[PDB]
């Protein structure tokens, strides 16, 4: 139980890892691998019958599904982050929802004479290239900000979904007490 | 010397309730009969011999206690442990040193070293299921595995130090004179020198 809780905490903390570090996938998928090792651990202990599923098995599969969804949504965030600005045009609804509406609600504050003729041509070309670079960087920053907002949304969603599921399973296990009477009336 | 160990086990035989003054025992032959011995796939019997022994105690000097002890000198066949245990350890030991030829800018040194460590950790399952779980002495395979584990760990430590040194910049550190003299001046003079200063 305790290693599963720790793995779940790390799966939550994946979403705080910046995309530029190039480390989300390794963390999430090695968490999945550790859960696989723990499934191997439980194989020698759990009963073999098929009338019902043990609650510890339910918790293990819930954790596996949580880590799988963390992997999937980390892939989504990385796809948004590394999106090439010139091959993608950001739709206007994406701009609205993920740059104007959601960031306020998630508390994400975005801050804010041959020689002379050849000289003029070269300088103007360099300035135009740098202006194009600036526009490209602005679109790239817009995509990266969308990725960051989506990452924060997924972080909060995972906190809520982990808390609710863990509380439900743990309270179901905790309040399963033995019978007060050896022969209860049914 | 496991798995190259030699074991001398015997079988002590004697009359439980009769002493030598009522029942005397003598071996049929100097050696055990091995004519119908089925071949062993794990051991070879180098030597075998049966010895009679007589013990007399001062309390009862006229009642000797007899036994016949057959001993067998057995040499383990080590091919199974060579193939399954020693060769993978040798491969991991060889892979340990290759990180120091990787460039730091590859961003794969820690991947290599840590994956070798993880392979050794998984291999510990094989070794502990195969190695004898006794504390009389350290088996030789156990010594070799501890050697490999300790030195991959040392490689990981030193690789972290090397990466830290590689990433240094004047905005964070300043080169001391002794580091420059030791590593840039003296050592390359006694090296291949293909790498320019």
């Amino acid at each position: 139980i305790a290693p599963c809780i720790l793995i779940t905490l790390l799966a939550i903390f994946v979403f705080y890892l910046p995309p530029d570090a190039g480390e989300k996938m390794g963390l999430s998928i090695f968490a999945l691998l550790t859960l696989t090792v723990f499934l191997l651990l439980l194989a020698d202990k759990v009963p073999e019958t098929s009338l019902s599923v043990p609650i510890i098995i339910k918790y293990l599969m819930f954790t596996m599904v949580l880590v799988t969804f963390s992997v999937i949504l980390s892939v989504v965030v990385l796809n948004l982050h590394h999106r090439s600005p010139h091959t993608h045009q950001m739709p206007l609804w994406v701009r609205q929802i993920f740059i104007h509406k959601l960031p306020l609600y998630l508390r994400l504050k975005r801050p804010k004479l041959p020689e002379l003729r050849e000289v003029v041509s070269s300088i103007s070309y360099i300035a135009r290239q740098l202006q194009e670079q600036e526009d490209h960087d602005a679109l790239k920053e817009d995509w990266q900000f969308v990725a960051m907002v989506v990452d924060r949304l997924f972080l909060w969603t995972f906190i809520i979904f982990t808390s609710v599921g863990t509380l439900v399973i743990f309270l179901d296990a905790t309040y399963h007490l033995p019978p007060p009477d050896p022969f209860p009336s049914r | 010397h496991f798995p190259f160990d030699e074991q001398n086990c015997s079988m002590k035989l004697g009359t439980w309730t009769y002493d030598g003054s009522v029942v005397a025992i003598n071996p049929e032959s100097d050696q055990p009969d091995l004519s119908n011995f089925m071949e062993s796939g794990e051991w070879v019997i180098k030597e075998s011999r049966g010895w009679k022994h007589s013990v007399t105690y001062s309390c009862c000097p006229d009642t000797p206690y007899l036994d016949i002890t057959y001993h067998f000198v057995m040499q383990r066949l080590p091919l199974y442990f060579i193939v399954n245990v020693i060769i993978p350890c040798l491969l991991f030991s060889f892979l340990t040193g290759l990180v120091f030829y990787l460039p730091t800018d590859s961003g794969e040194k820690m991947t290599l070293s840590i994956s070798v460590l993880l392979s050794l950790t998984v291999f510990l399952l094989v070794i502990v299921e195969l190695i004898p779980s006794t504390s009389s002495a350290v088996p030789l395979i156990g010594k070799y595995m501890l050697f490999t584990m300790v030195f991959v760990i040392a490689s990981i430590i030193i690789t972290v130090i090397v990466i830290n040194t590689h990433h240094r910049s004047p905005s964070t550190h300043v080169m001391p004179n002794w580091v420059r003299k030791v590593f840039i001046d003296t050592i390359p003079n006694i090296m291949f020198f293909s790498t320019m200063k």
Partner: protein, 103 residues
């Protein structure tokens, strides 16, 4: 292997191999836990000493992974996504480095 998790603090954030090292140490600890689980009975009278160390090490390695995530998050901030206040600059670039005898 458990003590090996402490080297991540000395790894630079530009190497991009910090959380990988820490989570791999966690995986190795899990393998050791699997190894130990076959060798003792599942009694509740006490936690074994090796079990106590393994739980303590797993918790510490998890905390180290969280710390590495936070350190990388701080490292990869830029003016276009975060604002670096003067208080943070004063605390983390002047006072703490000289207290800690950093270069």
């Amino acid at each position: 292997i458990s003590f090996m998790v402490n080297l991540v603090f000395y790894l630079p954030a530009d190497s991009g191999e910090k959380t990988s090292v820490a989570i791999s140490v966690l995986l190795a600890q899990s393998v050791f836990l699997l190894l130990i689980s076959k060798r003792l009975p599942a009694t509740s009278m006490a936690i074994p000493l090796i079990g106590k160390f393994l739980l303590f090490g797993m918790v510490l390695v998890t905390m180290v992974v969280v710390i590495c995530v936070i350190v990388l998050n701080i490292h990869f901030r830029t003016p276009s996504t975060h604002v670096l206040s003067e208080g943070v600059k004063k605390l983390f670039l002047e006072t703490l480095p000289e207290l800690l005898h950093m270069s």
